[PDB]
Design a protein around this ligand. Structure first.
Ligand SMILES: CCCCCCCCCCCCCC(=O)OC[C@@H](O)CO
Length: 159
């Protein structure tokens, strides 16, 4: 009894390197979900660039992003996250962080009311295609077979 596991995938754990090691910029590379409808929100997107910062209060992080839409428009977004000590989970729902096969990579798992999806980010806007192939392969194995790759043909919007 064998042949029933998915590729190796480790959740990020706490040590006190988290989260300073993750701050700075990131690019949205690809998403996977049980169905297309959890990825629908990303259909008109060319690229998204993000910046993560230390919050203002104690266990807090400022996220900024600018979405470059396929039509060329730029849409700014801002969110605040709350870490829990001992945990790498982000509270805005919960986001689990996982290590990635790609150097400079990171994968998120978003859980919520009757929806779920995996989202790949990297420091580089153009990581190796292998990295993306391994993420598709891993997520398909976890039953998120619907896949979207951001095209990243246009320049990042300012952030
Ligand atoms: C401090 C450790 C966290 C580092 C994670 C860096 C990845 C930053 C992106 C987080 C995106 C989550 C927001 C979200 O729901 O995505 C929807 C779109 O607007 C972008 O994917």
């Amino acid at each position: 009894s064998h042949m029933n596991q998915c590729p190796e995938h480790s959740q990020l754990t706490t040590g006190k390197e988290f989260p300073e090691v993750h701050l700075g910029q990131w690019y949205f590379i690809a998403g996977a979900a049980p169905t297309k409808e959890e990825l629908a929100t990303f259909d008109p997107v060319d690229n998204i660039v993000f910046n993560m910062a230390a919050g203002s209060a104690p266990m807090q992080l400022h996220l900024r992003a600018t979405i470059r839409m396929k039509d060329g428009l730029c849409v700014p977004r801002k969110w605040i996250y709350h870490l829990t000590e001992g945990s790498t989970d982000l509270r805005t729902m919960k986001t689990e962080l996982f290590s990635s096969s790609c150097p400079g990579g990171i994968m998120l798992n978003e859980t919520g009311q009757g929806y779920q999806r995996f989202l790949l980010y990297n420091r580089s806007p153009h990581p190796p295609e292998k990295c993306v192939e391994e993420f598709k392969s891993l997520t398909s194995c976890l039953d998120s077979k619907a896949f979207l790759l951001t095209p990243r043909n246009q320049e990042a919007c300012e952030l």
